[PDB]
Amino acid sequence: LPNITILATGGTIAGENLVNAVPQLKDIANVKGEQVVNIGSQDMNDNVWLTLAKKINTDCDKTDGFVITHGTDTMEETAYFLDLTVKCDKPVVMVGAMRPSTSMSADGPFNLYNAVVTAADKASANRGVLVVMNDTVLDGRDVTKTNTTDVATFKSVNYGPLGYIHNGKIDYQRTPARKHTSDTPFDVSKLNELPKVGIVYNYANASDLPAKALVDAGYDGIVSAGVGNGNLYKSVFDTLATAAKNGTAVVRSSRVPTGATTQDAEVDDAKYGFVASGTLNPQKARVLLQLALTQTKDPQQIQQIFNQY
């Protein structure tokens, strides 16, 4: 049976003695566990992302597959960052739990089994970094937390899941078209920090003060959580238009939960030097802007990255 390595970033999701908390694991894989860090995923950050990507890239030859236990609140961010930076061609399957392991009908035990199932399936390779939640296999790019409490909260709300899991078997009927893992230029192996990218929210009577404080602090890039198709309130627009011209990378995304922020529709991106996020929501667009800045600062080149990854 396959060797699967579970990497923990926080508290347990089942019951390392995960094999005894969920004993059916041993029937389908030889499982070992390492505790890379122990934090709540709302405090997730750049430092954790780099050592995770380094650890998976380094240990790729020792194992057949990676399962990562992670909190749910930012799992969709870490999955996309790894989706872009992992160079290992074995499956990397992220999993968490919407109910705590010691509460009634806890979801983590079965989620973990299914995560392991997915990570040991030979059909799972070459589909990029995955998230396995509620009997479903979702790609790291599009998967997002959809509901604040529901066990079924994780959905790929724009293009759908890759496969459903029934009785330890996976019917895979899709694979992500955007370039992932190996197909990307991004290499973080020797980086110790990551370009500073903040996110500002748009609303009625919106303040430019948040955007201005990131401009003042010399942030390399800003992501706008626009309204509608990536639209900005006039104050925020002016502040970010100014900032664009003097070298800040500005990416128009949207607060709207589904749908692309499209190029040349509402906003002359070419005129102002902006970048349209596509279907990347603000926190997802941040992850790609961070990595884009490490290869080029040119707004047209970043846009092409946003259309390719």
Next chain:
Amino acid sequence: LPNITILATGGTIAGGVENLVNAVPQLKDIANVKGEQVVNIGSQDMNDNVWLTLAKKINTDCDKTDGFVITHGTDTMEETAYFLDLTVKCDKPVVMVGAMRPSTSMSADGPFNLYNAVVTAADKASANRGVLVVMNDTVLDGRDVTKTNTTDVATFKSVNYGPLGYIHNGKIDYQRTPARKHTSDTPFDVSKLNELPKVGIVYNYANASDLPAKALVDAGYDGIVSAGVGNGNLYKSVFDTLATAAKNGTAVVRSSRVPTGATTQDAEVDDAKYGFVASGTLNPQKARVLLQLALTQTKDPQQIQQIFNQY
């Protein structure tokens, strides 16, 4: 037929210039329609002054007509409808309507949208249901309704509690009504008010900077709404700034960036400890609306929290 007043806030959503009665001629089958332009703005530039203008105007002219319809851009229609859901005291229907396609485009949605919005505003059964949004054959309550997709004509959905009724052939089969107190049944009164408490929104995400939150406390904002992660949780740096702010006067409301579901009281964050308010199903721009109006009522977090549980 009933008398219905159209209040435009921007460009026209139906073509073929405030006089939409020629653009959708079958409006005269259902109502006697008159129109005024109150402002003319892209909704992405919506603001407190427009909000106060709409509410005072509806409250004053209530006796003059049987119902209103407000044409509004879609980017922020969800914030305006909830603002009005809480300030309008006219018992008559107030239906907001927009268009996800330009009025000059193929299969422009505005003409049928406005038609259905007049149906709704003239329907006898549309009363006491609060301020409404009518889009794509659907009647939506002003609280729960939100813009779900960046481009889709079906974007507007009441994602937590569902719609109030569907509209087929100019008739509505209502089957729900918002149980939260609205319009008349609130204490919020803007009739003598000229400005609104300053309330900003801050986003949470991995490696989130405290700078945006600091700047709004440094500017002396009266409230801050957090677009938290998960069940309204907060990144470390942002937690520290907002916990400070909460004790030194600022009213902090914990909402969530997640598009559906409640931010509940003391799920994990101890709200009573830090003096926080949980928003419930109110997303960050919805929560800003109610906090703004609550701040005109009180400054104490425990009674702002009662307001978020009632309205």
Next chain:
Amino acid sequence: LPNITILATGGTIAGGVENLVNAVPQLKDIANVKGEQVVNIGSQDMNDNVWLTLAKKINTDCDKTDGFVITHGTDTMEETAYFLDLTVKCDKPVVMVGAMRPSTSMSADGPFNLYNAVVTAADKASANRGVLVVMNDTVLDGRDVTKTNTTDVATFKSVNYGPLGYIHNGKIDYQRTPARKHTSDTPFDVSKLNELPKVGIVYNYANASDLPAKALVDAGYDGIVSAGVGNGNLYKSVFDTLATAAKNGTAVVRSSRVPTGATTQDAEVDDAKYGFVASGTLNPQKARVLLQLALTQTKDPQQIQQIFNQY
């Protein structure tokens, strides 16, 4: 604490044998729970006799307890809840609950589901809302609720009008109530009844055979529900058989195979011409329920149509 009665119709949905009080021990924090097995069947074998048993039992024992909870298989829980939504005359809460995972499996959902179903049945605020289904932290009205996915623990959704409230930490934030008349407010009375009118369902699709519909008219069925296509439209052969049937006594209800949305009156099919009834948002198995009970009230299509517009 309130007294709550569990009525089981099949296997146990929570383990660790009618006595579920040991399987979910925290039930004693919220209610005093007693249980009876009334039948023991896989829900795929649900039938009129079980339905009449449940309704008479609830109606007779109403005085004996403060609320019921019914454990039921998920395959047909949506038909039983709507049947009871129309026949139960007990004013007290009736909450149905099931499990999409076997009780012996990893992350079995039954134990927390039953817990939440007792919360709901004991909640004072759960009254007069009609017969309920509680699944996956959600309270759903008995009319609109349907099984949406073959396997998902979140399968049960009120797909046309949304849920009534969400359940967090044993409290419910109700925000809607079904406006359609239910329970006490109906005329349907099964207290003296021993059987139900025979009502079958027939499917529509391209190149559909008339044979299934013919066989139920040949068997003398009292009603036939059509799972039409689109807005309750009918394949040619099936149209002809059912139009014949409608005039020669048989009551035909046009519903739709499409999982959401109303089959409306005279969208395209001239219902008054052929003597048809349109089902509204009632899917084919929901429509069978109401037609069955309407046939015990009357046989005339125009007044069956009023019933489909009221209940």
Next chain:
Amino acid sequence: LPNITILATGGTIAGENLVNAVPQLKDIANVKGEQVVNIGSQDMNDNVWLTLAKKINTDCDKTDGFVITHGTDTMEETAYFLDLTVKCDKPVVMVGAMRPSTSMSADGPFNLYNAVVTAADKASANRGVLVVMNDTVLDGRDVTKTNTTDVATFKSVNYGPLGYIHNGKIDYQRTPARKHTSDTPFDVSKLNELPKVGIVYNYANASDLPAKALVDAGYDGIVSAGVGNGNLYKSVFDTLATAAKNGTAVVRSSRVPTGATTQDAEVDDAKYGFVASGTLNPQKARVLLQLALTQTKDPQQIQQIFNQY
């Protein structure tokens, strides 16, 4: 500009003078139209399906792409049948309209443009037969009518869309994994009828009489619209179990709108000689059972077809 051939099966959806009903078509393609038949799609049937597949296969060399105007009520059935029987490698794009062409804010004009856009995109080839509705590109297998009146009713409810259409451009991020068009054995070129397959509905107190009438009439195959994961009411089960043994092909699908009817879960398919429909809903499962019967009658061989197509 590409040559696109519009094939009409019923009434117009815009306004052959479709070029003058929607004049923006001429800017993006050279369009001609033929009226293959004129019926309401609720009366759609086997005869129409065969001549359509024959016509598309025959005329494949004359044009660059096919657009088919079709009623909405059965569009999801015809799209999957063609998805399995078209041998032409140019795009075949089905489109209809949820609002009539002469009513306010009619959807057919813009749907038709987008259908033409999709049919002329070189990126659309090799994705099987498509359905284009409400700015979305959906694969013929999974696409289904979701709502009785909504313009947005057509959704791929299990695996998601292939791409979204904005301003005449398509971001394709998925392609169907199941075998389609050329990759299938099915060839209808010389067939003049198709094996008889009926569908029976399951519910509480369900009658076996419908199933029995199709058994009596010697139907080659039955599709069960089960309850839950493909479950049958005891009468229907017995009738179909008997029928299975004496040569009828029985396929367990489900009335439930999303989710697979999976093998060996609720029902011993091997014991009774049944076939599990997977994610094919009853009307979709009928289309594959019809075509499966033309290559083999063996329940195990049909099951493998249901796992491959």
